Design an enzyme around this catalytic site. Structure first.
Site, PDB file in Angstrom:
ATOM      1  N   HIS A  71       5.306   0.652   7.912  1.00 39.48           N
ATOM      2  CA  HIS A  71       5.490   1.495   6.735  1.00 39.48           C
ATOM      3  C   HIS A  71       4.664   0.975   5.551  1.00 39.48           C
ATOM      4  O   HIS A  71       4.597   1.618   4.505  1.00 39.48           O
ATOM      5  CB  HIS A  71       6.984   1.606   6.368  1.00 39.48           C
ATOM      6  CG  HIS A  71       7.561   0.395   5.700  1.00 39.48           C
ATOM      7  ND1 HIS A  71       8.470  -0.437   6.315  1.00 39.48           N
ATOM      8  CD2 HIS A  71       7.394  -0.099   4.446  1.00 39.48           C
ATOM      9  CE1 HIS A  71       8.820  -1.404   5.485  1.00 39.48           C
ATOM     10  NE2 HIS A  71       8.180  -1.218   4.341  1.00 39.48           N
ATOM     11  N   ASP A  95       8.509   0.069  13.664  1.00 41.70           N
ATOM     12  CA  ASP A  95       8.057  -0.246  12.311  1.00 41.70           C
ATOM     13  C   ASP A  95       7.306  -1.571  12.311  1.00 41.70           C
ATOM     14  O   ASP A  95       7.538  -2.432  11.461  1.00 41.70           O
ATOM     15  CB  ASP A  95       9.243  -0.305  11.345  1.00 41.70           C
ATOM     16  CG  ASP A  95       8.810  -0.359   9.888  1.00 41.70           C
ATOM     17  OD1 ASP A  95       7.629  -0.073   9.599  1.00 41.70           O
ATOM     18  OD2 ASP A  95       9.657  -0.678   9.030  1.00 41.70           O
ATOM     19  N   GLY A 151       8.475  -5.249  -2.043  1.00 42.86           N
ATOM     20  CA  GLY A 151       7.227  -5.979  -1.925  1.00 42.86           C
ATOM     21  C   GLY A 151       7.311  -7.155  -0.969  1.00 42.86           C
ATOM     22  O   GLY A 151       6.320  -7.846  -0.739  1.00 42.86           O
TER      23      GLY A 151
END
Ligand SMILES: [Mg+2]
Ligand SMILES: [Mg+2]
Ligand SMILES: [Zn+2]
Length: 642
Positions: A71, A95, A151
């Site tokens: 992602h 993912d 992040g």
């Protein structure tokens, strides 16, 4: 579109873990490295701080492989000593993404001691303790704001000995408070390190199965292939997203093969008794899904389509097929996830140069290209369309802009013309042109869990992917030669779509097919559970809950919002009925709220705001129980990607 390294973490043993973070490259460097795909400098550390210029995230190297989340990195290469480095592993469903780790980097070892105490290393070198909850998660000792964890996806989740237990990929929250941690277990990494060819039509099995067909458009997968199946004695159903394609295939078989198939669409239905039926996903749903013992083979064509109807149709097929007696479901597309667009017959493709008369997204358009004939220019914004159509008219061209909010009759049927439009044209228009000029910029819907008071439906500007690219250039060269001009090659076909799509499905399901939320869930579950399709975050339980609470919608309002083609006809219509029943105005007076026009003089005070579908002009109260219901739905544990 390369991923570059802008920093690194040093992760060693003395909580017994110590981490140290180190910024190593600013914005100029990141852009340059990202554009050239070349990084000549030495590398180090156990974790890398990665960047795509706009966004930033982490990568952990384990067993000589630099792992990170899909992602964040998608299908992108990693900048390397010699140039771009392609991915060695890639799983949107997990993912997960992996490249060979740059020399100089150090590996961490996978955990095989089954600990309960877990430790997350953030992008800032903070070590956050947690305790294991099942297989892919951990409960934080100290709950914290979700903002502090963004992040840090791709960072390591460590055991007390420093082995990797898994890769951080998301936070489980309670309205903005991160209660728990979600990660990709190292065991998933091993499975992925062991894995093709769908080029030709699957054979018909003895028991129900799902098969795949990855072949170009027009190659015959929508015509020749159905006939081959039928000629073996099977009854075939072919499903497409558009009316024009559905009708088009029928006409082809008739004119070229002398076969007159059944045709089912909202605007035209023809039953002939033939063994081949062409239908839209929309009409298939309105018909009730699969009918018992009607078809041996269902072909879900253009299965890269992630519009609400397409997803619902496909998921309905995958849920009902076997029980209805189907032997084979075929999931067919030219652009499966991770794939590139390829040249298409009769369509010349020519990149734009830097010379011309009209500047255009860092390139230029020469007047010669568009003087005389009919041409389509795709622009990413209403504002840009108006600006460009104006500039072209001042150069003696019959140019005209089109975006959502204008009628399609603004486009002359014949004669010279330059149409400069947004993606709004795709749904709004059918015809085609002599050439397409593409900015290669995509504007897509996204949901923001904003808590002001609940969720916001907004947009995102991103690089065009293979699917988008195909759709836009498909607007030329229909039956004859065409030309496609572009600013850039985009990204490969996306394997992941936004949660807002799920919302779209529940909305569409209720608005257009009277589907109950619980039933929409069953169908989306089938979709998710089938490999080879685009994936999403599992927010099914969340969206089911909010739509379950939206009871007693004004039918008249729902009707008008449906006529007007609102992507979220149900959410809009519902907001309008609470306002009306409250004797209050809508959140603004955009066209979105037409339906409430006649009642304007009768409404006053603050609007009971349920959610944000656009800008807010009027005073708002967060008081309605409708607001409190949606808000309490968001207190339930909600996985937010980080
Ligand atoms: Mg075909
Ligand atoms: Mg296709
Ligand atoms: Zn361990």
């Amino acid at each position: 579109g390369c991923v570059s390294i802008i920093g690194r973490l040093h992760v060693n043993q003395r909580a017994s873990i110590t981490a140290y973070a180190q910024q190593t490259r600013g914005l100029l460097g990141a852009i340059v490295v990202s554009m050239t795909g070349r990084d000549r400098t030495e590398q180090a550390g156990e974790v890398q701080i990665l960047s795509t210029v706009s966004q930033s995230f982490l990568g952990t190297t384990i067993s000589g492989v630099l792992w990170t989340v899909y992602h964040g990195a998608g299908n992108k290469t990693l900048a390397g000593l010699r140039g771009p480095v392609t991915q060695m592993y890639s799983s949107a469903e997990g993912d997960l993404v992996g490249w060979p780790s740059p020399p100089g980097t150090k590996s961490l070892e996978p955990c095989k001691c089954g600990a309960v105490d877990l430790y997350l290393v953030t992008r800032n070198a903070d070590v956050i303790p947690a305790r294991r909850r099942g297989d892919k998660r951990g409960a934080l000792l100290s709950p914290r704001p979700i903002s502090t964890l963004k992040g840090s996806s791709g960072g390591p989740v460590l055991c007390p000995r420093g082995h990797v237990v898994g890769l951080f990929r998301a936070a489980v929250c309670s309205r903005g408070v991160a209660k728990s941690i979600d990660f990709i277990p190292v065991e998933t990494l091993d499975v992925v390190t062991r894995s093709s060819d769908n080029s030709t039509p699957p054979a018909v099995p003895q028991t129900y199965q799902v098969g795949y067909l990855h072949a170009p458009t027009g190659s015959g997968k929508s015509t020749k292939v159905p006939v081959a199946y039928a000629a073996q004695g099977y009854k075939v159903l072919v499903l497409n997203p558009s009316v024009a394609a559905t009708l088009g295939f029928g006409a082809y078989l008739s004119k070229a093969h002398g076969i007159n198939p059944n045709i089912r669409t909202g605007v035209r239905t023809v039953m002939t008794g033939e063994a081949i039926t062409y239908s839209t996903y929309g009409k298939f749903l309105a018909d009730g899904g699969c009918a018992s013992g009607a078809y041996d083979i269902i072909i879900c064509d253009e299965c890269h389509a992630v519009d609400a109807t397409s997803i619902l149709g496909i998921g309905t097929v995958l849920d009902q097929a076997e029980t209805a007696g189907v032997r084979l479901t075929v999931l067919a597309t030219a652009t499966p996830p991770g794939s590139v667009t390829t040249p298409h017959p009769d369509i010349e493709e020519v990149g734009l140069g830097r010379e011309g008369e009209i500047p255009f997204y860092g390139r230029a358009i020469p007047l010669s290209c568009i003087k005389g004939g009919r041409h389509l220019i795709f622009c990413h914004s209403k504002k840009k369309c108006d600006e460009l159509a104006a500039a072209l008219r001042g150069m003696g061209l019959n140019a005209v802009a089109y975006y959502r909010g204008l009628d399609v009759s603004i486009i002359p049927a014949q004669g010279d013309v330059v149409v400069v439009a947004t993606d709004a044209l795709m749904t709004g228009y059918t015809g085609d042109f002599d050439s397409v000029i593409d900015c290669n910029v995509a504007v897509t819907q996204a949901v923001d869990f904003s808590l002001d008071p609940t969720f916001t439906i907004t947009t995102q500007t991103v690089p065009q992917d293979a699917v988008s690219r195909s759709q836009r250039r498909g607007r030329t060269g229909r039956g004859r030669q065409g030309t496609y001009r572009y600013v850039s090659t985009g990204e490969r076909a996306s394997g992941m779509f936004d949660s807002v799509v799920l919302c779209e499905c529940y909305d569409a399901g209720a608005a257009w097919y009277d589907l109950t939320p619980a039933e929409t869930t069953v169908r989306l579950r089938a979709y998710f559970n089938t490999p080879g399709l685009p994936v999403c975050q599992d927010h099914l339980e969340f969206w089911e809950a909010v739509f379950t609470g939206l009871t007693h919608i004004d039918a008249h309002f729902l009707s008008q919002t449906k006529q007007a083609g609102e992507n979220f006809a149900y959410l809009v219509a519902y907001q309008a009925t609470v306002c009306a029943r409250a004797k209050a105005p809508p959140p603004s007076w955009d066209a979105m709220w037409k339906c409430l026009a006649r009642l304007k003089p009768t409404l006053a005070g603050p609007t009971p705001l349920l959610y944000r579908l656009g800008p807010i002009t009027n005073e708002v109260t967060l008081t309605h129980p409708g607001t409190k219901y949606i808000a309490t739905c968001m207190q339930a544990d909600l996985e937010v990607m980080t």
